[PDB]
Design a protein around this ligand. Structure first.
Ligand code: SF4
Ligand SMILES: [Zn+2]
Lengths: 675, 134, 124
DNA sequence: ACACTGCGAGCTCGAATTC
DNA sequence: GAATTCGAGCTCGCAACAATGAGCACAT
């Protein structure tokens, strides 16, 4: 299959392509020749992954001096392994079509707990534990006596790596994480340091977000890799929530009381440098003095640094090198583990963030515990407001960076928050042989009562009955699986336990089993494996869950799991938290974003992410109701993207509960029949 | 570069807001221009919704907190020099503004009297029809 | 409520009739009717009774045309079949229906019929 | 230093017939 | 030739808008 986009000869690994998928390769080539960014919305997960890889890998053959390396930041380790398996399928197609071999290697990067051979350290569960026991065997003072080569502890694989792993590189043959461990097994090398060494000489590199947008990581691993590359941020809805949490720390009473134990253990070891311990003891009793107050919430992002020089007299010139010398002090102290000093590194990371980064930051000290009048639980948040302060290296260092997901809801918000100027900013819609989706907005109830989940319209039983009368009448006409996302956990409890006291939850269990998705991961995976079992045998099930949850982002509901997806209200965040109430005051002055146009943007990208989870494939069909009155408004249904908005007609816009069934009952009957 | 005093600077009150070519040091709150609300401009200069955002070039606005709501929404603020430059551009001259304001202020006095006239025709229709039949 | 009365007519097996008035004289979205009891339309519009017929063909389906005989509507209802008999359609005449007097029909007595004339003549 | 979206007024037509 | 009846669509003034929750991948 020789497929010709506007100037290039793209070798596609399939036979039939979709008519919109040609324009996705056409609009992505328009970015790469212009050497600029791009915000492309493209619905599916696969197909998008194999058409983005068919173009760029074929682009670096015809213009091998303009692009050299493709970086592919995916969300987490399951989609890291999925992209590489879509690359062998493209490489082996090129192996059959051309009959030759190539100088083409593709890697995959992850943590040390995903690339590990050493048996005494690999079953360690927590990720901060495997980083310490590796460092107990790979530190430069542990190898200092290993120049003698004694029977003193070490890593067998790491000392066998740097003696033979620099002369010869990896030849070819795209590597998964399991292939790098298998190559590390039969050769005896470390997989983690082989992948990090060979990341400088590769052509496709697939890691997570945090190697590139996390500032205390990206200068160590992705520093000198490529100046003319292509970065792809796949499934990049929450870039804003990633660049905020990477530059935001959190301090409480439990953290600072553990830092006194770290300074206690540092006092016993110096007697066995002294100005730096009195430096940290000065800083620790100030932040404890600042949490000592029981007063109103207050914010002072550079004025914290002025009052830190009054009672304590510590300036910002030694405070900038606070986290540097603490990394140097533990090196000269020759300590065994470094996970035990994790509260003190968090205080050292807090000290180097107030000193340097103060333009769009805040320090929100909240002695007032949430929802309770007087309970002694203070906490100060060092919250970042500006999501463009972690991509200013990435938008500058690389040549062209593409932000692609399936549900970028307005495309003109992402270049407003993130300070950059794209060159295409395009959207697409999937082609279909049927109507593969039937979105509806089930508004008012069966007795003409409004259904919305406001804050005043939650206690009254004229709405809780109309949610129970909806899930009852959809569980009798939908086969094999209904996913019901609620807005929170305290609203899922106060509705299910108020359906049970009425005669509504008795009649839902006659039709389908119901499996509540709880917060702890042990009960959830039990209730999820029985859900996928109940959809496969006769009964069918209802997985009622929370929209800002684990199941809403991770688990993909392929066909006959979740034929319907029911949104029980607009999934807003808590719109009166003092952190969110301060970020929106930064989004009003800077970028002139309205305060109400961001709460709905944040909600219509989490209500369109979990609804868009119901359809992944060719023959997948799926109902998707929106059970709130407020979804019908123009500033809300105009947000949700163009591939679920081009089937939302004006008839399915204020359907009542009984009228929404006969749209669903006619839709599933029509889809059940062959082509 | 200011366009009134010719002083060189980085930024100021305006020219990050209303695109007005002046420095902050003239400032003349009540001697060059003031902040007017979107509702005030819309009901005072008789500007529609499709003149503050689509007549080229589009003039932008400033979002602030609604003063007597404090938790509800916003309050757009346009510039009074940008409005009187736009109202003099959309509605002929200065005098053509007010002459089309007289026909609208009598129209709301026109609807006030005819709604007290259509009720006389409607309510007496039900009482005349009972007498007219036999 | 034009959009939901029309949607309660199609996807609901309970609401069965609907009383339009001069709206469906074009290519609207009237959802596949099966009978059409046309009562007292415009004067001699043979365009109209070929657009009322357009709802029916969208016996299988069959539409009626109520005429008050020995009045001016008898001359009108032959002007409007003048286009449909030139296409092949045959208009039967039902002088007496199949047992109209036996069910519970309205306006049985003359007392309830005297009140309707006083409602009509009071318009003027 | 207030204010989004629906929703009825005028305005001006068309179709066919009275006046 | 000049009304009516009842429909149509296009402008456009008018009145008043809103926004409530909970946790593991990634560097020495
Ligand atoms: S040095 Fe190699 S073998 Fe040792 S813990 Fe790290 S990755 Fe595992
Ligand atoms: Zn000046």
């Amino acid at each position: 299959m020789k497929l010709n986009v506007d100037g290039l000869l793209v070798y596609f690994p399939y036979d039939y392509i979709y008519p919109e998928q040609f324009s996705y390769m056409r609009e992505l080539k328009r970015t790469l020749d212009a050497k600029g960014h791009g915000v492309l919305e493209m619905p599916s997960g696969t197909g998008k992954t194999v058409s983005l890889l068919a173009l760029i890998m074929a682009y670096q053959r015809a213009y091998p001096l303009e692009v050299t390396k493709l970086i592919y930041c995916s969300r987490t380790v399951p989609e890291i392994e999925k992209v590489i398996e879509e690359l062998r399928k493209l490489l082996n197609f090129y192996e059959k079509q051309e009959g030759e071999k190539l100088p083409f290697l593709g890697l995959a990067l992850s943590s040390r707990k995903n690339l590990c051979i050493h048996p005494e350290v690999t079953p360690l569960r927590f990720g901060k534990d495997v980083d310490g026991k590796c460092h107990s065997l790979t530190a430069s003072y542990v190898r200092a006596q290993y120049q003698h080569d004694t029977s003193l502890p070490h890593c067998r694989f790491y000392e066998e790596f740097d003696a033979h792993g620099r002369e010869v590189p990896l030849p070819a043959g795209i590597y998964n994480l399991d292939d790098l461990k298998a190559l590390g097994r039969r050769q005896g090398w470390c997989p983690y340091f082989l992948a990090r060494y060979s990341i400088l000489h590769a052509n496709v590199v697939v890691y997570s977000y945090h190697y590139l947008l996390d500032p205390k990581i990206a200068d160590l691993v992705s520093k000198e890799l490529a100046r003319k590359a292509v970065v792809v941020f796949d499934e990049a809805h929450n870039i804003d929530n990633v660049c905020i949490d990477s530059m935001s720390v959190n301090l409480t009473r439990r953290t600072l009381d553990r830092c006194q134990g770290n300074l206690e253990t540092l006092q016993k070891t110096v007697l066995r440098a002294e100005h730096f311990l009195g430096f940290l003891r000065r800083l620790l009793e100030y932040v404890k003095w600042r949490l000592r107050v029981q007063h109103v919430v207050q914010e002072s992002p550079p004025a914290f640094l002025s009052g830190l020089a009054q009672r304590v007299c510590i300036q910002r010139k030694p405070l900038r090198f606070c986290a540097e010398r603490l990394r140097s002090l533990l090196h000269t102290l020759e300590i065994t583990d470094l996970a035990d000093f994790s509260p003190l590194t968090l205080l050292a990371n807090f000290a180097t963030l107030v000193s340097t980064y103060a333009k769009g930051f805040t320090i929100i000290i909240e002695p007032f515990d949430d929802r309770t009048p007087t309970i002694a639980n203070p906490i100060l948040h060092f919250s970042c407001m500006d999501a463009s302060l972690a991509i200013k290296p990435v938008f500058e260092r690389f040549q062209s960076v593409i932000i692609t997901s399936g549900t970028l809801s307005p495309l003109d918000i992402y270049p407003k928050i993130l300070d950059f100027h794209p060159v295409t900013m395009a959207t697409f819609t999937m082609t279909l042989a049927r109507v593969c989706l039937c979105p509806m907005i089930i508004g008012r109830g069966n007795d003409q009562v409004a259904i919305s989940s406001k804050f005043e319209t939650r206690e009254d039983i004229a709405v809780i009955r109309n949610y129970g009368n909806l899930l009852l009448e959809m569980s009798a006409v939908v086969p094999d699986g209904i996913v019901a996302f609620f807005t929170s956990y305290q609203y899922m409890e106060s509705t299910v336990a108020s359906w049970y006291e009425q005669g509504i939850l008795e009649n839902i269990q006659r039709n389908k089993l119901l499996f509540i998705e709880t917060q702890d991961g042990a009960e959830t995976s039990v209730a999820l494996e029985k859900y996928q079992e109940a959809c496969e045998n006769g009964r069918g099930a209802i997985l009622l869950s929370v929209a800002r949850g684990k199941v809403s982002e991770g688990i993909d509901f392929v066909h006959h799991y979740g034929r319907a997806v029911i949104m029980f209200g607009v999934p807003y965040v808590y719109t009166q938290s003092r952190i969110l109430k301060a970020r929106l005051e930064y989004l009003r002055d800077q970028f002139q974003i309205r305060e109400n146009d961001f709460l709905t943007f944040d909600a219509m990208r989490h209500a369109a992410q979990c609804v868009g989870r119901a359809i992944r494939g060719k023959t997948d069909y799926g109902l998707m109701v929106f059970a709130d009155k407020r979804f019908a408004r123009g500033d809300k249904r105009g947000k949700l993207p163009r591939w679920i908005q081009e089937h939302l007609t004006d008839a399915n816009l204020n359907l009542t509960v009984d009228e929404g069934v006969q749209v669903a009952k006619y839709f599933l009957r029509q889809m059940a029949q062959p082509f | 570069i200011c366009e009134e005093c010719g002083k060189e600077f980085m930024d100021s009150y305006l020219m990050n807001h209303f695109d007005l070519p002046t420095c902050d040091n003239c400032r003349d709150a009540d001697d060059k221009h003031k902040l007017i609300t979107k509702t005030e401009a819309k009901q005072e200069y008789l500007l529609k919704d499709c003149d503050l955002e689509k007549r080229e070039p589009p003039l932008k606005f400033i979002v602030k907190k609604n003063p007597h709501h404090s938790q509800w929404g916003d309050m757009k603020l346009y510039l009074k020099l940008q409005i009187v430059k736009r109202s003099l551009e959309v509605w002929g001259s200065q005098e053509a503004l007010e002459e089309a304001k007289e026909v609208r202020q009598e129209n709301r006095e026109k609807m006030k009297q005819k709604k007290f006239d259509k009720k006389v025709k409607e309510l007496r229709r039900a009482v005349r029809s009972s007498v007219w039949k036999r | 409520e034009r959009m939901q009365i029309l949607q309660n007519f199609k996807h609901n097996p309970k609401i069965n009739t609907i009383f339009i008035s001069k709206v469906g004289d074009t290519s609207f979205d009237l959802p596949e009717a099966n009978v059409l009891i046309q009562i007292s339309s415009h004067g001699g519009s043979r365009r109209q009774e070929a657009q009322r017929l357009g709802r029916v063909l969208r016996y299988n389906a069959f539409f009626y045309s109520l005429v008050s005989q020995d009045t001016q509507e008898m001359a009108y209802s032959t002007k409007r079949q003048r286009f449909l008999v030139d296409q092949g359609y045959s208009f039967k005449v039902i002088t007496k229906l199949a047992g109209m007097e036996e069910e519970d029909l309205a306006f049985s007595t003359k007392e309830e019929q005297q009140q309707l004339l006083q409602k009509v003549l009071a318009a003027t």
